[PDB]
């Protein structure tokens, strides 16, 4: 567990720690102020006795891949600095919480119809997040049927931006979910990826998982890593299905369960409980869950599906 990085000397120098945003496994997540240029951070602190005691392989290669990609909705790793205990890593900071911290997902009673709600989140205790509270005002938005896709799609749109970056980069990710996106801000729905703990280059597949609920069929019937990136695609249908029906669509009841259930389920969008979505929304769906890998859809063809496309490649401008 050594990474070339800087001194934790240099580190206490250069910033200025302030509270936590989260906790992992191994150590906090803080805010942290970058002293020359007052850049707001995520210094995430992890001790490397902790970890000897599987991960190091994980954490190198999360590590090295997520320090040269260059990505809007990937979030930056700029720095790391260490010592014989700790590792630290400074990164772009996201002050809007996970997916589903923001986006309240839930079957609504009265109607059997899949509901969303836009929550302010506070988690950030950074100065900017606590300047705007201390002089705003605060909650909960209910969306509208039109809302919700438009804002899914939105978001859609960005974690296929991001994975056709990262195919085309020639890395299969492996853990797409929503708990792996955190938005950006409070002030806007930009989301960012977060985690790479899983991820591996295609040239480096058989050389000897994921959640469960978002794992493809091809990744759980194969006893090595002979698949592709398409299994990328899949999860994040699994991720589109639980933002548009409010449900994932093999919800097992323990990871048993689960894992049956997307080996052997096959779904079918033309039972009548899919008439709520649109018919593109239907039509992407089915694409993305497609079992048969050859005519599932890359994150390419999710990008010029008129889903994702259709407000692009406009001509004169009507607004
Ligand atoms: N760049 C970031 N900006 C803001 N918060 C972050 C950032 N990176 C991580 N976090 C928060 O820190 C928490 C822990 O990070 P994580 O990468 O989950 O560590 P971990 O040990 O892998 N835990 P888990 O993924 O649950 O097994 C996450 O839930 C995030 O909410
Ligand atoms: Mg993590
Ligand atoms: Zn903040």
Redesign the pocket.
């Known amino acids: 567990l050594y990474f070339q990085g800087g001194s934790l000397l240099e580190l206490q120098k250069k910033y200025h720690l302030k509270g936590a ?6 150590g906090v ?1 803080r805010v942290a102020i970058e002293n020359q240029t007052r850049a707001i951070r ?1 210094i ?1 602190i ?1 001790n490397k006795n902790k970890i000897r005691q599987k991960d190091v392989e994980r954490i190198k290669t999360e590590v090295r891949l997520m320090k040269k990609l260059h990505h809007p909705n990937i ?1 930056r790793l700029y720095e790391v600095y260490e010592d014989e205990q700790y590792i630290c890593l400074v ?5 809007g ?2 997916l589903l911290d923001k986006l309240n997902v839930f079957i609504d009673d009265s109607t059997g119809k899949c509901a969303m709600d836009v929550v302010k989140t506070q ?2 205790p950074c100065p900017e997040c606590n300047e705007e509270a201390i002089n705003g005002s605060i909650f909960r938005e209910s969306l509208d049927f039109v809302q919700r896709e438009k804002l899914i799609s939105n978001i859609m749109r960005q974690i296929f931006s991001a994975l056709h970056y990262l195919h085309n980069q020639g890395i299969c990710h492996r853990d797409i979910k929503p ?1 792996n996106f ?1 938005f950006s801000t409070n002030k806007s729905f930009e989301i ?1 990826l ?2 790479f ?1 899983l991820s591996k280059e295609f040239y480096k597949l058989n050389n000897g998982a994921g959640t469960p609920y978002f794992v493809a069929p091809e990744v759980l019937n194969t006893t090595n890593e002979s698949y592709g990136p398409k299994c990328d695609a899949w999860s994040a249908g699994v991720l589109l299905h639980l933002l548009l029906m409010g449900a994932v669509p093999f919800p097992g009841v323990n990871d048993a369960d689960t894992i049956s259930q997307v080996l052997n389920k096959k779904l079918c969008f033309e039972n009548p409980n899919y008439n709520v979505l649109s018919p593109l929304a239907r039509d992407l769906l089915s694409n993305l869950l497609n079992r048969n890998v050859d005519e599932r859809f890359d994150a390419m063809r999710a990008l010029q599906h008129p889903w994702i496309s259709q407000f692009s490649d406009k001509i004169y401008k009507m607004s």
Do not use: W
Not at 21 to 26: A, K, N, V
Not at 91 to 95: I, N, P, Q, T, V
């Open positions: 945003i989260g906790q992992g496994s191994y997540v995520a995430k992890m979030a990164m772009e900071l996201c002050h919480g996970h988690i950030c708990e955190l960012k977060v985690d703990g």
